[PDB]
Amino acid sequence: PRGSHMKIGFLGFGKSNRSLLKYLLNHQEAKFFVSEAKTLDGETKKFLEEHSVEYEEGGHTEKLLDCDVVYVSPGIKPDTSMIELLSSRGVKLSTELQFFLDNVDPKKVVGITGTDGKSTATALMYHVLSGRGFKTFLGGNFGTPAVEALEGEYDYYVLEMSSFQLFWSERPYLSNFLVLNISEDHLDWHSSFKEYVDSKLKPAFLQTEGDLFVYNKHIERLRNLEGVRSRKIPFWTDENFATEKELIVRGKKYTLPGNYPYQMRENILAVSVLYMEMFNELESFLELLRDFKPLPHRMEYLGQIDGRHFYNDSKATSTHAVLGALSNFDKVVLIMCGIGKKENYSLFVEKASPKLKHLIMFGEISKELAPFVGKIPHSIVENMEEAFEKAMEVSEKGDVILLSPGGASFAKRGEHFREIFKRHGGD
């Protein structure tokens, strides 16, 4: 009715609405208006001015009441004054996720939601679809907003979707919908648990018989899913579950490549079930799982030499991973090495300190750590052989010696450390 005089509003201007405005500037004839509660920085203003997008900052005014549609930033709360005025004046309210779901090919979307594990599970789905050779987009709440992907073409769009995005999405239709878990704590979400649940489950009740809904069966305690019309495959059942070492899908058993925490086992189970439904086969999934980056590393116990216990955490390539390994003991003689990531090690050192009987270092990471380590008994050596002997020398019967490097390299170091262990008589 209004041709190019359509007025499109943005309430809030975080990454969702910024990505959406950038898509619409290049795809739609309309007058655009951005409304920010705080101040916009200099770069953002220059950007809006370069494309003559009107804006207000320092408060939401009645200028938004003039809009034909307003896109709400996912973090905007439902009972705020501007939402109340907008609704009471009959202005249509939508959000960047809903726009995406209205514009993409529905059958190419894999929508993942959950309380825990959401980012890793989404990354795994992306990983295994990419590994089959599909051109695959990864984004959603934790990452790149989905509308970025509407430039060019993809085979699959793998989205992580939060309760906030789904709340503000009036009709969030997904052909492929995975719910990892729904849990009562901890929660970024404002208040009502029943609104949180209902927001997260919205897509399920929109599906048709040709669609797919894979879900954690514990959510059946919260909501009745009988009327959902899609192919529905629950996990944690008699046929779809995981124990510490095994994955069972359709009653079939597969050995997992390591013994992982509960959340990672659930992420694997969830994505398994969906992959098996899409491709009828899990051998390709398991092979691709092996190079999945967030996959926890094996901490291989090597054995003893003269009462000392050796653990090989060769794959720890960051401060974070070293802190993981450390939480398995109370005292340890620790060997670190490799190329230090650009970090601030004081946070790491104070967190590591109580667990360290002695720290041994070599490689360029020695230089990064040296300035913060005056606190604790420590030795800098030149290579792994020297590190090994120094570990034997500062240790006694009963101690644990742990290789957990913390830096990158140029199972090469791990192999080297194993070989040294053996040459000095290890088991």
For ligand NH4, the closer CB: 10 or 156: 10
Give 64 or 361: the residue with its C-beta nearer to ligand PO3. Answer: 64
Contact set with ligand NH4 (CB under 6 A)? 12, 14, 73, 75
Residue 121 neighbours by CB under 8 Å, 6+ apart: 112, 114, 178, 180, 267, 270, 271
Min separation Cβ 16 and ligand NH4, Å: 8
Q: Assign 3-class secondary structure to the chain.
A: CCHHHCEEEEECCCHHHHHHHHHHHCCCCCEEEEECCCCCCHHHHHHHHHCCCEEECCCCCHHHHHCCEEEECCCCCCCCHHHHHHHHCCCEEECHHHHHHHHCCHHHEEEEECCCCHHHHHHHHHHHHHHCCCCEEEEECCCCCHHHHHCCCCCEEEEECCHHHHHCCCCCCCCEEEECCCCCCCCCCCCCHHHHHHHHHHHHHHCCCCCEEEEEHHHHHCCCCCCCCCEEEEECCCCCEECCCEEEECCEEEECCCCCCHHHHHHHHHHHHHHHHHHCCCHHHHHHHCCCCCCCCCCEEEEEECCEEEEECCCCCCHHHHHHHHCCCCCEEEEEECECCCCCHHHHHHHHHHHEEEEEEECCHHHHHHHHCCCCCEEECCCHHHHHHHHHHHCCCCCEEEEEEECECCCCHHHHHHHHHHHCCCC
Report if residue 14 touches Cl ion, rule: CB under 5 A.
Answer: yes
Structure tokens at 263: 């959340």
Q: Is 113 annotated as a binding residue?
A: no
Please report whether residue 80 would count as binding ligand PO3 according to CB under 6 A.
Answer: yes
144 is annotated as contributing to ligand binding: no
Contact (CB, 8 A) for 403 and 390: no
The entry of ligand NH4, ligand PO3, Cl ion, none that residue 82 binds, CB within 5 to 8 Å by partner kind: ligand PO3
Give the whole-angstrom CA distance, residue 373 versus residue 282. 47
Residue 80, annotated as binding a ligand: no
Using CB distances below 5 to 8 A depending on partner kind, what does residue 203 bind out of Cl ion, ligand NH4, ligand PO3, none?
Answer: none
Our CB check for ligand NH4 shows the closer of 12 and 234 to be: 12
- The answer to whether 117 is annotated as binding is yes
Residue 140 or 406 with smaller CB distance to Cl ion: 140
Considering only residues 36 to 65 of the shown chain, the ones binding Cl ion according to CB under 5 A are 36-37
Whether 115 has a binding-site annotation, put simply, is yes
Q: Judged by CB under 5 A, which stretch of 90-98, 284-292, 327-335, 365-373 contacts Cl ion?
A: 90-98
Binder of residue 106, out of ligand PO3, Cl ion, ligand NH4, none (CB less than 5 to 8 A by kind)? none
- Interacting partner of 75 out of ligand PO3, Cl ion, ligand NH4, none (Cβ under 5 to 8 A depending on kind): ligand NH4
| Minimum CB–partner distance for residue 265 and ligand NH4 (Å) | 33
Residue 299 dihedral angles phi and psi, to the nearest 5°: -95, 100
Work out whether strand 156-160 and strand 136-140 pair parallel, antiparallel, or are unpaired.
parallel
Q: How far is the CB of 84 from ligand PO3 (least distance, A)?
A: 8
Quick one: what does residue 60 bind among Cl ion, ligand PO3, ligand NH4, none, with the CB cut-off 5 to 8 Å set by partner type? ligand PO3
- Considering only residues 4, 81, 255, 327, which one is a binding residue for ligand PO3 as defined by CB under 6 A? 81
Residue of 20, 34, 67, 82 that binds ligand PO3 (CB under 6 A): 82
Among 9, 74, 117, 140, binds Cl ion (CB under 5 A): 140
Question: Per CB under 6 A, which of residues 47..66 are in contact with ligand PO3?
Answer: 60
Give the residue with the Cβ less far from ligand NH4, 191 or 237.
Answer: 191
Name which position in 8, 9, 10, 12 contacts Cl ion (CB under 5 A): 12
- One of 9, 111, 145, 407 touching Cl ion (CB under 5 A): 145
Range in contact with ligand PO3 (rule: CB under 6 A) among 75-83, 117-125, 150-158, 390-398: 75-83
Contact pattern for Cl ion over residues 146 through 165, marking x by CB under 5 A: x-------------------
Q: Which is nearer to ligand PO3, 6 or 69 (CB)?
A: 69
Distance of CA 344 to CAs 296, 317, 340, 349, 371, Å? Answer: 23, 15, 10, 9, 11
227 is in an annotated binding site: no
Residue list for the binding site: 114-120
Site residues, ligand PO3 (CB under 6 A): 37, 60, 80-82
Residue list for the binding site for ATP: 114-120
